[model samples]
Target: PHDKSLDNSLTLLKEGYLFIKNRTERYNSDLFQARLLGKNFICMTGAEAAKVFYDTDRFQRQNALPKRVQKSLFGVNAIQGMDGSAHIHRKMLFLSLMTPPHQKRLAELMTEEWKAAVTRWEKADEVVLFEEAKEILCRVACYWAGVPLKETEVKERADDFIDMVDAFGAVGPRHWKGRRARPRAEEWIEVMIEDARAGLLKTTSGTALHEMAFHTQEDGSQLDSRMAAIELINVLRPIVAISYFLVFSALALHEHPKYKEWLRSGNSREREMFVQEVRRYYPFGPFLGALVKKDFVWNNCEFKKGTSVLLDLYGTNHDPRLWDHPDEFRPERFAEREENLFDMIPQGGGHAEKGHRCPGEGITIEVMKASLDFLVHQIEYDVPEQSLHYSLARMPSLPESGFVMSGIRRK
Candidate 1:
């Protein structure tokens, strides 16, 4: 029998880098070489580090996905795991609803929603930032997804979507609740897709789901209902996740004091900068994995098909080589190098010639910006000086005691 265990080979390396002073401070890691589940990909920055694979045709995403991710996110022909023309076409569908124009409108809608939330919160003594933000974003997303709602359905679906998306992330003992919500969330999305198919999506407006349902391949075959559902649900997963980030961003602003005035003054330019910084600095998902499709050679590495490679998102975002004081929460980092050639990817590469990069980021930016602007300008929130904050080591990085704040109309 052949033995693959090498004595002292594992102990030579640190468990992994844990970032202590990073903008996205959930864990403590800095640039170094490491592996998880026994795969070789540098745990480093996004400039030259991420750009090497993101720009290379050899390092493909088509088959570089992990088994569990493929099963849960893609399921069958999830469109995520597809390659070339198919991936491009499907990506375009998601983009139409998230581009500049759509994002602007969505920002307006979210502003209205945020104001309403503050109005409602005025009646209460304390509000749970994470829960309230999650539920609101879910409600806003349903409207964006083109769902017709009475007050009852809206409330239930909002809660259902939040619960269902939790199954994809770190719900732990609550995993069963996430599983249970899936069917109910799917049921609502099913009716949403059917309405899109029947042209009812046109009544309110074309949202992410509506465009996805109508998108056709180069050959003119519309995405089947299953494929459409998979894609829509895949989208729902992140909206819920990012909403938590928005809430956390609010808490960070409140605690830092320096950021509070900017967060509260309706400074659109500053607010936009803050959103970019939060998205970059905060640690939600710090790594992306890809599976090798065929024999590939690069950086003196000969990777065979089925090799899993990890792209360090947090490490990439905080690389000091590409940033000045990379650990600082300075939103101006982007503005300073607005036209620089350096790559600083938080939600994957801005645009690659191949595979699917993030198309929904625009909507993410808009939603977050509008939420921040509203929270900063319209609501006055009091933060406890000595209170529990987020434990970044945790998956998706949530608050230790849940971010709690009280709001009043900003004077």
Candidate 2:
């Protein structure tokens, strides 16, 4: 095999989510070496690669992420950066807030928010579902996390969430906007953390801000305000990020109306399968990064200690070997198969308790299901004549029209 002599960064920019999968297939290997951003990276995909990528003993997260991403998306020194006992402790704090009751409460909050949004949208010419869902989810996220938001602050705060997510794969103004949005959001939440710590604020027990603000570390001390704020953003940000999945859910309903028909019977299993298909068929997280813990060899490929490895999350979801007609959007693919942690990871794979897999996966599913239920059942709308095309080159892509709809009214 030949190393890609020219830096593959441009190729990554051009291909977006397909960069790794394309290269892996052409090279006829599950794992291969490529240069990105002036450094060599081992790119891997498929079920086996996910297994190795998520092995806690074989990979560590410290200093693995690029500084640009750290500044723009995940803040510096957040939970994504920690490892070993510290990571476990911090992760447990996050996992605690994801209890069954809490997830159900979040779903209820989203349902309520959507109902209110539809009432407001009824009088409008057309509503951009993606943009509107961001605001709706933002309010739901704030209320569920126990972060108070004024009516005036909803759009601004939701735009801040958009900036952070949109800037991660962007450059120039977009990237700087994301860089700028992080501190603005962190600063806003930091005050809340301070108030909570001083008992000047009251949040529901077990809420994100409440639990994260008071969460004790392994050394038995509270997280400093900045770290507390970062952790709190960790909770709030992903919940807001579900806006992408919600948009895709709308796209699925528009393109695949049969699933909407399937949902009409009030079968949650059908809704869940549709949600899984949306997550798998659409691009949410393209890939995840980790540092090689120690020099090791897998599948005859030698990975050096401290080298960066990128696991192909998008490719694995669409891997031809893993699914029949992988490119097709068929929710029923999941209907017959049991859940395999490694194969269908639109989010990161592996055990949530032991690995870096997102603990918010349950929340994402619940929220998507609730949104789907609302879109298919509680409301009716027309897909106005507008662009429905989405670009593969766009990271976290959405329909060009943002899934526009008119004739909004309650059932």
Candidate 3:
């Protein structure tokens, strides 16, 4: 299957999340060939395709992403581009932070932030959950990571981290905001890395700030100050990235209000299934990119050395083959289903310690669950009449209204 064009990259930009899935359906195949950015490429979907795409030997992370993404969302030369034992070594730093005890610490911090946010929301006639969730996660992230955040600087810093995520699929002004957000935030973290290394800024052992500051590569060399800061922002930015999930979780409850009632009087399993369904049902990460490590063929599709391939992360999650009622919001789908690393990959796939699967997945779930619990138990709010609609066309999409709420008060 193939798309006939000098370059369909423009189509990809325009089509957004369904670019690969659209073609696959048209071609009646799971894998297809096309030209993107003036080079031969393949777009693959399904769990089997994800298996091959994540095989480190067949697909390399190095230079897989365009510099625009590196400069904006992920920092240049960060772990997203790394491979082999070196990648594993660096990945452990991220995996270490997801240990259960650490999950609880971040959840506790998130609860505190939510309690504080609720207090403020109570006094306001309107609250935008997206905006509030970002600031809450930002404060919670820095506090949990042992990074100092002045109360005055919280909003600014939160917005910067958000701008970084916002830039992932953007162009022009939005892209520039994401591009500039990295360096501005990097400068602040660079100083933290330097001071923490010199024992000036006191960071507790095992904290993300301390770990990123002192992390050693397989060669036993400390990461350079800028790279250390870049990695630290990786730690910080994704936590704030969870705000999208938090808001989306809120939207899910509103749209699927039955789940809200289930969560209110139901078991922990209900909460877990609801959160998993939100991840699977809602659009989050659009897709993942990797470069072909060597010339190879899959099901007669030839891929050349250094060729690029994309896995439709969002599409795969919603694939009719892997999901029942692919467009429906049904948490019960997870009740009997066993999810694998690849099939439900909002965070990419494969072994977190060895491959590109996001180590932050656990953190995302914990934080979302906490926010869901808080929304159901700790606060009462009126979701005012506003557009809760989100676009699949926009990268890092949010509801047009940012989820308006009024008449908020503690229960």
Clashing pairs in 2: none
For model 3, residues 74-140, the per-residue Cα lDDT tens digits are 9999999998888889899988988888888888888877887888889998999999888888988
Whole-model lDDT, model 1:
0.62
- Model 2 misplaced stretches (Cα beyond 4 Å): none
**Residues 82-122 of candidate 1: C-alpha lDDT, one tens digit per residue:** 66676777776777667788778777777887777776788
Give the least accurate 10-residue stretch of model 3, judged by summed lDDT. 1-10
Write the residue-wise lDDT of candidate 2 on 117-176 in tens digits: 877888999999988888888988998898999989999999998889888887789899
Q: Using Cα atoms with residue i matched to residue i, what is each candidate's TM-score against the true structure? A: 0.82, 0.98, 0.98
Q: Where in model 3 is the C-alpha error above 4 Å?
A: none
CA RMSD (A), model 2: 1.2
| C-alpha lDDT of all candidate models, in order | 0.62, 0.88, 0.88
